[PDB]
Design a protein around this ligand. Structure first.
Ligand SMILES: O=P(O)(O)O[C@@H]1[C@H](O)[C@H](O)[C@@H](OP(=O)(O)O)[C@H](OP(=O)(O)O)[C@H]1O
Length: 1565
């Protein structure tokens, strides 16, 4: 730490970064809040603080000292942070100079420091104000209370010193300060330009200098040096987000906006920009706009800043300023901002300017505006549709017609002169070929207009598709496409237009390839490839006729592509290839192609891609087509197996099964005709591997997915058939038919949303919704069957689109329909985990500011503990934000109430998040009436609702809030208990309860509140146990009990009061008297009458007949507790009451539907058992395929060289790292596949070996030492770095487990090369600290969980420790001194001692001091014995070699784990010995080995003495003698008591060298 250096000071308590900013035109120093997930992630150059050290000479700075005076300086402003009097005695405020003693501050180290040495960097400091002799502190109150969502936190001063009030130093890159200084310079130049603008005078040379400044700013913003190209044309692939943020905070964008605005404010005029005088001004505006476009690229915050300036963009539009392109970029970047910005007048302005210019670029701007992220925006598309289809704008659009002249096409276009021309399309194309500029321009304009029409019709917007279809016909488009005379680009534009207008329309609908449900009657007696398609062939034949010619066009075009030697050589041909492939994909997905045609098309599509953005996109689309065709093959196989089952059922029972025959048949289908390619499956593999080698990330991901699926055909088909459902019941079949018809009708209506949204359609769909609500069914079993049928139907998707349909608040009929739809979704999710997961998939739609949607979300999350565990803090933030904004009703609170508890289980993190969010929201959300006036208002409302309370009354809302707080209180959660106790005092509850008139529901809520907030407290609060308000509440409880009993005696009673006394009151009293903490209180002697009267009231409650049997039993338990209390609490029972209490003590002392279904289940089971090994063989084939990729490719090829160099495996590893975040399942599968590659080969039986042989022969031509060689190959390809990076940065438990498993498999066998690679990576890389931190933190958490479990008396945290310890042992295997010493001290800034952590883990698992005492048998059980053995083995591996430092550490550690290690040998471990003696023997042997390793080569006697102190000699000798006798009792096992005793004897001798008594005892007879 030195003066003149800058660091960031972070406050741990506030979890905020100190920043200084000009909030209200005046600089304020504060603790800013950040919405970013990581608090440290959010940082600011303004937040940067420069440290200055006071020294004798003002110029001299020297280096900082803890005692030396420190001054902090806001970097951007340069003003020193200072403490000044606050109107919290003093409040921090910046000062211009350090001359004033206000800036001076004193720093106190949080941790001990060496004398007054120089302050270490990145060290915690305690701030204080030496000037005023006070200590600085942070306050929760914000410095910007006025603004919404205040981020700035005020900082005050206190005389006392607080350890919590300390700030941590954080290093700052010099580049950040250099960028801030250069940004201040850039602001200075911008201010010089602004000064010239304000003066209204700028020389020509000065304006040229401004242009040069803009050019330099362009270079800096791009972060790219000049390439000789125009700064306006400057290109940057990815902007620098840090630089963009710096610009935004510096207001350089604001300066540029002001510079653009001022000339037109005149100095310059937009019309005059055409004049040569203001042409340089126009160029300067252009530079500004280009810089803005580069600045705001892919940054929501920069786009937000520009949004406030969007108006000046609108005004500037219509002139040559490139504002069109900049606006299009920003608007495409953000859609929501586009929704705010869009307005019909801007669409009209675009129309007017594009008409005036008559240029294709303006149309291109609109085309870009229409679509974003390849997804159309409905509102903007509708506005543009109206504007374009307006008859007024007919002139701009080019009209087209077809005339015989066997037919030809002519186009008519209008000039700016308003002259109309008409000409043949072929003649235009030929003139463009000749080179006529006018004809080429009109053809390009027409192409752009065609693309504009397709863009309008994007995402099936019928409103304009109708008119566009009226104008353009299918035959015309087909003729234009087929014609070869026209240019390739125009042919491709026709392809796009056809696809977007006609092929995608209402009559066509997407087809799901595999149908889970089937009809038992429909099941064919026999099935072939033709018969499978025959089921829907008729509809296929009818639909084909419309596009039949286009199908042939597609087929012949793809045939031409495959015929061509070079598939994607020509760019112009590639342009049309993309469109044709996309059209084929769309047709296939809509289902026009038959299955045989799809199988034929697979060969061509794969051959095209068999050994630039457009080519990659085409290959991706081909992959998608292959995916769909494989999905269809799956359903064909399912149908074949179903037909087999039906045929066997018919044969056996005309109305014993030949399962062997059926299995023989099914193995054939699972194993020909159905193959995608005619090469035998080789070509698919080669294409997939080549595409994996390809660079494009989506293409590689898809290729990897298909490659993995290619070798798992059998398992997927078995799973699908297990999911298959058959309809055999007539009633359910009729329901299925009705549901199909109703769903198709509803889906058609939702599709024609535009038609039936503004009639009888509304009533029709209300009726359909009610029909589906009836269809849901009654009864749990019936509901489950109907939910299975619904899942098979996929109606849930149609319902989600119905909800997605746009609407306005005024449409009450539509809101009714939405309510019905929500009820139907509720019925779908009712007690169905699968349906609940499906809803979770699309929950993003459900997240809306609507109470009905919130209730539906509550039902979605109902009773799903896994979903609660994976719940999202952002979702919780959304809910609490809605409550803060409105907090109208109890539904938002009820959602959290449901989240709190699931399956009768609690989640501490969820409860803590709820309470923390409540605290952040503050008193406003948590309404109380504690004050007397608020209590009076509550009393008035309670009196008004005394007869009854509304379901949504504000009193009911407050009650529900209190109930949610009680829900948080449940679970004896000490941490949130603290917040609850601070939240509410017992006195307010006492006042409300003791009020003359209190609502019974309010009383139950408060009794429950006390039941958990105070009785269920994990830690004892002295206040409750010293309060006699409990006895006041108990006399009130007796009054209520008397009221209930007298009511039932009078024959008139209130069920609410009865339940109040029965459940909440009884549970609260029972818990209070059960609490051991309450037993400490001795106020029962003062309130002796009260407690005896409470017992009398409970006895009367039990005696009265109205009490229920369950309530009677609960009351009896409570009365037993009250009796144990009554024995010794200065209370004497009356003798008669004691007679009934003695009676109480005595009481306490006292065609066949089911046949077909079961047969199908049995055949499923039998087939699964039959085919189990074949699945394993098929999976194993992939390991060989990955091992030898070259065999697939032809010998001597370029791809052969690439695979021979190991390209495929290295690319797979690198893409695994790249994709760990994008595709978790794919990453995990790849890691497991690498582990399988590493693992040793194994036989698979006769049938499995036959299958493996056949598969390998078809796919590949034929062309421990092996394990070590494979490990070396993987290490060279880079598995070690992949493992290290995954363990370092992954947040996925599965990914971490798989990474550790891969590390263990790599290092297995103690490979010195892998160990050295790990050491080299650890030493060289800068993240070694991060890796060791991850491992050490995991081990520490495992230790903590083990301690918690021991206190209770097996945890994923403890389970994960086993592979970690195995990994450490394997790293230290073969006595690698470098690794053994590295683990102890990795030589970094922070050193983590994994050896001590392992020893402490052993100690805590064994029980520590209690285990030393000798209760080790109680702690050790069959479950943890393996982990104990592994820990001992790891410690032995650490010690052996020997490593003197490790041995000393283990022997001399403060935990005294050597005592536990010796107690392992000495103790009997009786509970485990009785049942499993082998584990006890193994434990003893490993402990003896560790003890011997500890003293392996130590000549000195310290270690031996320390061991012997714990291990007495006589007991040792007794153990040695006992083992030999135990030999005879030995049962067949690997371990031998004789061998164990021999090892203990060797240890005993080595210890005896030092111990004369042990020597004498060891001497035999
Ligand atoms: O991940 P997203 O959607 O971009 O949102 C980010 C984050 O959620 C905050 O909006 C903001 O942090 P603060 O709340 O600290 O401002 C940050 O901008 P920043 O980079 O200016 O912090 C954003 O980038």
């Amino acid at each position: 730490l030195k003066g003149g250096d800058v660091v960031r000071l972070f406050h741990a308590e506030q979890e905020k970064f100190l920043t200084c900013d000009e909030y209200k035109g005046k600089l304020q120093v504060f603790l800013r809040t950040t919405l970013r997930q990581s608090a440290t992630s959010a940082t600011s150059s303004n937040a940067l603080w420069e440290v200055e050290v006071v020294h004798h000479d003002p110029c001299r700075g020297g280096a900082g000292h803890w005692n030396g005076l420190y001054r902090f300086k806001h970097l951007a402003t340069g003003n020193y942070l200072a403490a000044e009097e606050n109107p919290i005695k003093y409040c921090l405020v910046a000062v211009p100079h350090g001359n004033d003693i206000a800036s001076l501050f004193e720093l106190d180290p949080t941790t001990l420091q060496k004398t007054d040495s120089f302050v270490p960097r990145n060290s915690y400091v305690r701030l204080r104000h030496l000037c005023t002799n006070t200590w600085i502190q942070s306050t929760n109150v914000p410095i910007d209370i006025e603004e919404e969502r205040p981020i700035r936190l005020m900082l005050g001063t206190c005389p006392t010193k607080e350890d919590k009030e300390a700030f941590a130093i954080v290093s700052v890159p010099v580049s950040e300060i250099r960028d801030l200084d250069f940004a201040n310079d850039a602001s200075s130049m911008l201010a010089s330009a602004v000064e010239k603008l304000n003066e209204g005078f700028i020389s020509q040379n000065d304006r040229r200098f401004v242009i040069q400044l803009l050019e330099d700013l362009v270079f800096f913003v791009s972060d790219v040096p000049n390439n000789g190209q125009n700064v306006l044309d400057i290109m940057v692939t990815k902007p620098n987000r840090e630089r963009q943020k710096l610009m935004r905070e510096q207001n350089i964008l604001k300066q540029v906006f002001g510079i653009l605005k001022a000339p037109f404010r005149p100095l310059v005029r937009l019309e005059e920009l055409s004049d040569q005088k203001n042409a340089p001004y126009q160029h300067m505006f252009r530079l500004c706009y280009r810089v803005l476009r580069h600045s705001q690229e892919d940054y929501r915050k920069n786009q937000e800043h520009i949004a406030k300036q969007f108006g000046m963009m609108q005004s500037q539009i219509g002139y040559d300023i490139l504002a069109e392109d900049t606006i299009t970029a920003l608007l495409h970047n953000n859609r929501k901002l586009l929704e705010k910005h869009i307005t019909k007048t801007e669409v009209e302005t675009f129309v007017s300017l594009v008409r005036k210019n008559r240029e294709p670029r303006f149309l291109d701007y609109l085309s870009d505006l229409c679509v974003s992220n390849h997804i159309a925006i409905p509102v903007t598309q509708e506005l543009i549709c109206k504007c374009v289809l307006d008859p007024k704008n007919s002139d701009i659009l080019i009209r087209t017609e077809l005339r015989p002249v066997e037919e030809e096409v002519w186009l008519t276009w209008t000039d700016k002169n308003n002259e109309h021309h008409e000409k043949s399309v072929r003649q235009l194309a030929q003139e463009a070929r000749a080179g006529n500029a006018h004809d080429e321009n009109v053809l390009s304009y027409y192409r752009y207009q065609l693309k504009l029409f397709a863009r309008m019709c994007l995402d099936r917007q019928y409103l304009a598709i109708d008119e566009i279809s009226q104008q353009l016909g299918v035959d015309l488009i087909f003729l234009c496409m087929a014609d070869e005379m026209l240019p390739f680009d125009l042919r491709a534009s026709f392809c796009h237009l056809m696809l977007h207008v006609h092929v995608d329309r209402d009559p066509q609908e997407l087809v799901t390839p595999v149908k889970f449900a089937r009809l038992w009657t429909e099941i064919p007696t026999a099935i072939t490839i033709k018969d499978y398609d025959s089921n829907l062939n008729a509809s296929r034949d009818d639909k084909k006729n419309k596009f039949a010619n286009t199908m042939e066009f597609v087929e012949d075009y793809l045939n031409n592509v495959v015929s061509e030697a070079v598939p994607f050589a020509n760019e112009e041909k590639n342009k049309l290839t993309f469109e044709v492939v996309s059209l084929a994909h769309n047709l296939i997905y809509f289902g026009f192609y038959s299955f045989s045609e799809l199988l034929r098309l697979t060969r061509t599509l794969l051959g095209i891609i068999d050994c630039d953005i457009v080519v990659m996109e085409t290959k991706l689309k081909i992959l998608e087509i292959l995916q769909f065709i494989l999905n269809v093959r799956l359903d064909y196989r399912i149908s074949y197996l179903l037909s087999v089952f039906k045929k066997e059922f018919v044969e056996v029972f005309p109305m014993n099964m030949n399962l062997d025959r059926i299995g023989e048949q099914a193995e054939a289908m699972f194993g020909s005709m159905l193959e995608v390619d005619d090469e035998g499956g080789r070509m698919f593999l080669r294409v997939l591997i080549h595409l994996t080698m390809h660079d494009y990330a989506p293409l590689v991901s898809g290729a990897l997915q298909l490659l993995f699926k290619h070798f798992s055909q059998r398992q997927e088909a078995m799973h699908t058939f297990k999911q298959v459902q058959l309809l055999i019941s007539a009633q359910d079949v009729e329901n299925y038919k009705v549901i199909k018809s109703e769903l198709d009708r509803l889906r058609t209506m939702v599709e024609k949303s535009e038609l039936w949204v503004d009639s009888e359609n509304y009533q029709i769909v209300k009726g359909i919704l009610e029909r589906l609500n009836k269809m849901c069914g009654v009864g749990e079993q019936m509901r489950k069957k109907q939910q299975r049928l619904l899942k098979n139907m996929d109606a849930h998707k149609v319902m989600l689109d119905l909800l997605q349909i746009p609407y306005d608040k005024g449409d009450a009929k539509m809101m009714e329909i939405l309510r019905y739809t929500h009820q139907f979704l509720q019925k779908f999710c009712a007690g169905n985990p699968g349906n609940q997961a499906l809803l979770h998939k699309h929950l993003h739609l459900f997240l809306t500011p609507g109470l009905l949607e919130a209730e539906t979300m509550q039902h979605i999350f109902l009773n799903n503990y896994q979903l609660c565990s994976e719940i999202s803090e952002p979702v919780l933030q959304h809910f609490v934000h809605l409550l803060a904004t409105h907090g109208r009703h109890v539904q938002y609170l009820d959602f959290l109430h449901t989240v709190i508890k699931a399956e009768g289980k609690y989640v501490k993190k969820c409860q803590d998040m709820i309470m923390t969010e409540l605290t952040n929201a503050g008193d406003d959300v948590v309404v109380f009436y504690n004050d007397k006036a608020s209590l009076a208002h509550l009393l008035d409302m309670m009196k008004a609702a005394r007869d009854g309370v509304e379901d949504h009354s504000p009193l009911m809302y407050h009650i529900s809030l209190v109930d949610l707080l009680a829900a948080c209180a449940e679970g004896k959660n000490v941490y949130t208990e603290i917040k609850c106790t601070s939240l509410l005092p017992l006195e307010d509850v006492v006042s409300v309860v003791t009020h003359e008139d209190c609502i019974t529901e309010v009383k139950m809520a408060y009794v429950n509140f006390v039941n958990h907030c105070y009785v269920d407290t994990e830690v004892e609060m002295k206040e409750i146990y010293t309060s006699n308000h409990i006895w006041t509440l108990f006399e009130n409880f007796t009054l209520d009990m008397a009221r209930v009993c007298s009511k039932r005696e009078k024959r008139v009673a209130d069920p609410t009061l009865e339940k109040y006394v029965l459940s909440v009151v009884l549970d609260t009293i029972n818990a209070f008297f059960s609490s051991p903490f309450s037993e400490n209180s001795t106020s029962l002697q003062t309130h002796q009458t009260i407690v005896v009267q409470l017992l009398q009231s409970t006895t009367r409650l039990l005696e009265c007949p109205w009490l229920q049997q369950q309530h009677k039993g609960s009351v009896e338990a409570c009365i037993r507790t009250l009796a144990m209390v009554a024995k010794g609490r200065a209370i004497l029972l009356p003798m008669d009451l004691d007679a009934h209490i003695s009676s109480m003590l005595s009481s306490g002392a006292s065609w066949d539907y089911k046949n077909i279904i079961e047969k199908l289940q049995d055949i499923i089971t039998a087939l699964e058992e039959r085919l189990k090994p074949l699945v394993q063989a098929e999976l194993s084939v992939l390991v060989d395929v990955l091992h030898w990729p070259e065999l697939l490719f032809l010998e001597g090829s370029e791809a052969y060289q690439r695979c021979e160099s190991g390209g495929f495996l290295s690319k797979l590893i690198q893409h695994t790292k790249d994709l760990m975040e994008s595709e978790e399942k794919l990453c995990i599968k790849v890691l497991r596949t690498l582990q399988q590659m590493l693992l040793k080969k194994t036989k698979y039986g006769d049938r499995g070996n036959q299958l493996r042989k056949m598969l390998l022969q078809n796919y590949l031509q034929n062309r421990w030492s092996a394990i070590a060689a494979t490990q070396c190959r993987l290490d060279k390809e880079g598995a070690t770095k992949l493992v290290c990076d995954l363990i370092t940065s992954t947040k996925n438990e599965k990914i971490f487990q798989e990474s550790i498993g891969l590390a263990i498999h790599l290092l297995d066998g103690g490979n010195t090369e892998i160990q050295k690679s790990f050491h080299n990576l650890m030493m060289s890389d800068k993240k070694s600290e991060r890796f060791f931190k991850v491992l050490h933190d995991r081990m520490k958490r495992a230790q903590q969980e083990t301690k918690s479990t021991v206190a209770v008396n097996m945890g994923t945290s403890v389970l994960i420790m086993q592979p970690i310890l195995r990994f450490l042992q394997l790293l230290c295997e073969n006595h690698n001194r470098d690794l053994q010493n590295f683990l102890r001290c990795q030589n970094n800034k922070t050193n983590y001692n994994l050896v001590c952590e392992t020893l402490q883990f052993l100690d805590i698992m064994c029980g520590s001091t209690t285990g030393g005492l000798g209760l080790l048998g109680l702690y050790i059980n069959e479950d943890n014995v393996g982990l104990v053995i592994q820990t001992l083995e790891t410690l032995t591996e650490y010690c052996q070699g020997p490593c003197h430092e490790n041995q000393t550490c283990i022997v001399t550690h403060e935990s005294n784990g050597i005592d536990i290690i010796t107690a392992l040998i000495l103790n009997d471990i009786s509970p485990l010995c009785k049942y499993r003696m082998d584990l006890v023997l193994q434990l003893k042997d490993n402990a003896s080995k560790l003890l011997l390793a500890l003293m392996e080569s130590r000549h000195d006697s310290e270690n031996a003495e320390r061991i012997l102190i714990s291990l007495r000699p006589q007991e040792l000798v007794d153990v040695i003698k006992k083992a030999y006798l135990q030999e005879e009792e030995r049962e067949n096992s690997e371990v031998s008591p004789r061998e164990v005793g021999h090892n203990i004897y060797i240890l005993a001798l080595q210890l005896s060298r030092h111990n004369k008594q042990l020597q004498h005892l060891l001497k035999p007879v």
